Design a protein around this ligand. Structure first.
Ligand code: 5TX
Ligand code: 5TX
Ligand code: MG
Ligand code: MG
Lengths: 433, 433
């Protein structure tokens, strides 16, 4: 079936090399690219890097590309397996790599081939990508998700003092997904003028994901900024707020440092119970309906203590890193109620669907996610519709590595027609529609 | 030959609506999107916006999309012309529009259908897109271009006090184009560290084109940063400097204001003689080999005087707007010696090739260009190769709306393979190679 698998090296949205994979069947060419994170969790699968300090400062992927063309490609072509056999083709790759964290061939090399197989399998069944993903996941009631646009930036990769990473907007009161695109964009442009009118003309430049990073320090000031633009645009009750705290980035000696980019002074460190009491204030004072990574990736006691005392959504990112082993622990410990899905964290389409199936079996919500370094690949758009999760965050309505997914989700919605259903206020449990 | 033409509304890299067109033939689906400029010239073809401030601040393209679906689509379909009839189909839309500035259907409507015809016409010929454009333009010796990465930002869409808009790097001394992408990315990441020290952590967020907008006033100060990053990366030998002054954006009462973002003051105004005398210093003190829009779009006396007194490449952008009639005045006035090719300035693939050949047949270099508002479409990547212009500028190695062109340009070099040529130091007239 597979006539040729060919991989190359392309530059992501950050200017860093990443793996692109071309797969040739009888029906044509199928191309897929692998994203790359910035503030990574130490538990995810290995992103294969060259380490050549004189070529892209060590960030090349020539070795992961070589494992594809010289080993994985001839082994999958020799199989005789159709491109529709996603599980069998993914298993055989996990067999050849052998390692637990996919350290032999790299997760970006395995996922790149796995992503192109799934696209080729969709054509062989004469199905769109999202419908083929749904048949793989055992679903049939596709739903368009609620987009979460990261519009205010803080954390390890923002030149400000704001400690928390992402302040997002979720147009839950939209009529359709295309209607949600307009609400998120108009509030994004409205926020651009407010930031320019309070922090200067030189404070509107965007970060890796397209959001603004003004020089603020209090996290409640960021929420007030978001709510200020939400009301100013006239969507006070149709758009709520989500948060990616990424609290692992300032986990100092068992406490939390909401000013970790300042000179290290351990007097300002707060406890997990103090940090939770701050989240509770964010929930009562602001329309915060989702909080991602509220504590450290290993502070399971704080996760379970907080989730049991809140009614909003708790999203595990670095806590679960799309890993079925760590998801089961969070399910048993009730550490969170939502799973952030990043296919490159686990390294294969089959495992990513298995991680999503595991969470949904336990009443969890699932949010398909991007990485800081994205490409022009639009796979996760068809993934979030095929898995029927109800929520996806893949950047602000800015930079086309973010909008190629948003545009595709508008092509998917228009294609579904009357069959399409928008999650809306049911972004947590879309199956009740 | 055309089975169906259907257009929709997507969002470009800045969150603004733009026209995307699907064209169906017996050989499959063909997709193309239309960019949108920021420092737009007055003589550009009309971009039809809705002006309905109930959606997207009045920046929708529902009118232009409707003109495609309701009028242009059934016209080309009922015409029976083959998709390879690029000129017959483009002329069919020009006479149907019947307007000089294309202000009846909008240039974004005609171009999206034109860009999709050229993509479908390449498959009927069983050729890659760049080979079809090479045959549409009478070329045969494909040349890969020298990329110009805008790394320092000023002008009207910047938050700093920098008058001149763009400062670019051109890896003319690279071995191939894949090596040119590595040289530009290494300098871009090197520049990010240089700016981070001299200006702080908060001055590393990117602009519309992925470049930085550091708070600097002197235009010689921007050339000091670019030359420092070039040297601190070890490529003092292989990389030169280009500039997009966009002097039309600070043309004030026949004079020029190098501080138009500060509160206006006529004491700061200088003449084209003073402005031209400043360019003579930039050419000598720095490896500046190309200057775009050194004077206003209407100061033909300053263009003709400066061009005949320098040996560098003088590029016309807002002056010529890819228009055969405005280029024709520039070839007689000898205003410049390089055409900046923007397809949406003129509105059609056929006219964009005619305007390109009018320059190349008068001894002009040609540089294919992007706009500030771009999409994931990569048509101009196959366009700069097909026209054999030898130089393209389409942003910094950041934001995938820019990398989508550079990635495709990397796949074209690999696809051409043994017969692939790089413009190198012959980027102004690659016809010698
Ligand atoms: C910083 C990021 P990654 O790059 O994936 O580490 C971006 C994503 O929004 N997210 O959830 C993160 O934690
Ligand atoms: C700012 C821009 P446009 O948006 O096309 O006006 C971008 C391009 O680089 N260029 O030459 C310009 O003048
Ligand atoms: Mg996160
Ligand atoms: Mg210009």
């Amino acid at each position: 079936s597979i006539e040729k698998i060919w991989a190359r090296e392309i530059l992501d949205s950050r200017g860093n090399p990443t793996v692109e994979v071309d797969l040739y069947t009888a029906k044509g060419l199928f191309r897929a690219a692998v994203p790359s994170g910035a503030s990574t969790g130490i538990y995810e699968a290995l992103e294969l890097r060259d380490g050549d300090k004189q070529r892209y400062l060590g960030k090349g992927v020539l070795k992961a590309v070589d494992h594809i063309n010289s080993t994985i490609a001839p082994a999958l072509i020799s199989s005789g397996l159709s491109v529709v056999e996603q599980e069998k083709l993914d298993n055989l790759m996990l067999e050849l790599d052998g390692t637990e964290n996919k350290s032999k061939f790299g997760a970006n090399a395995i996922l790149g081939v796995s992503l192109a197989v799934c696209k080729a399998g969709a054509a062989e069944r004469e199905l769109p990508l999202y419908r083929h993903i749904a048949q793989l996941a055992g679903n049939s009631d596709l739903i368009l998700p609620v987009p979460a646009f990261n519009v205010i930036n803080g954390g390890s990769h923002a030149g400000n003092k704001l400690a928390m990473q992402e302040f997002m907007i979720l147009p839950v009161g939209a009529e359709s997904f295309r209607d949600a695109m307009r609400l998120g964009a108009e509030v994004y442009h409205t926020l651009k003028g407010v930031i320019k009118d309070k922090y200067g003309k030189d404070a509107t430049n965007v970060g890796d994901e397209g959001g603004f990073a003004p020089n603020i320090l209090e996290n409640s000031e960021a929420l007030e900024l978001v709510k200020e633009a939400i009301d100013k645009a006239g969507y006070t009750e149709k758009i709520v707020i989500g948060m990616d705290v990424a609290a692992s980035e300032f986990y100092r000696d068992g406490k939390y440092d909401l000013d970790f980019k300042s000179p290290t002074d351990p007097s300002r460190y707060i406890t997990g119970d103090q940090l939770g009491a701050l989240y509770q204030d964010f929930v009562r004072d602001y329309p915060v309906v989702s909080i991602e990574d509220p504590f450290d990736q290993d502070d399971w006691a704080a996760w379970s203590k907080f989730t049991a005392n809140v009614g909003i959504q708790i999203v595990g990112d670095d806590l679960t890193v799309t890993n079925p082993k760590r998801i089961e622990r969070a399910v048993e410990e009730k550490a969170c109620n939502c799973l952030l899905l990043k296919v490159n964290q686990i390294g294969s389409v089959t495992e990513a669907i298995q991680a999503c199936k595991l969470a949904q079996e336990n009443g969890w919500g699932v949010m398909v996610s991007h990485r800081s370094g994205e490409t022009e690949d639009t796979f996760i758009a068809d993934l979030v519709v095929g898995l029927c999760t109800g929520q996806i965050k893949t950047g602000a309505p800015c930079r086309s590595e973010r909008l190629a997914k948003y545009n595709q989700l508008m092509r998917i919605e228009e294609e579904l027609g009357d069959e399409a259903r928008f999650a809306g206020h049911n972004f947590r449990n879309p199956s009740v529609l």
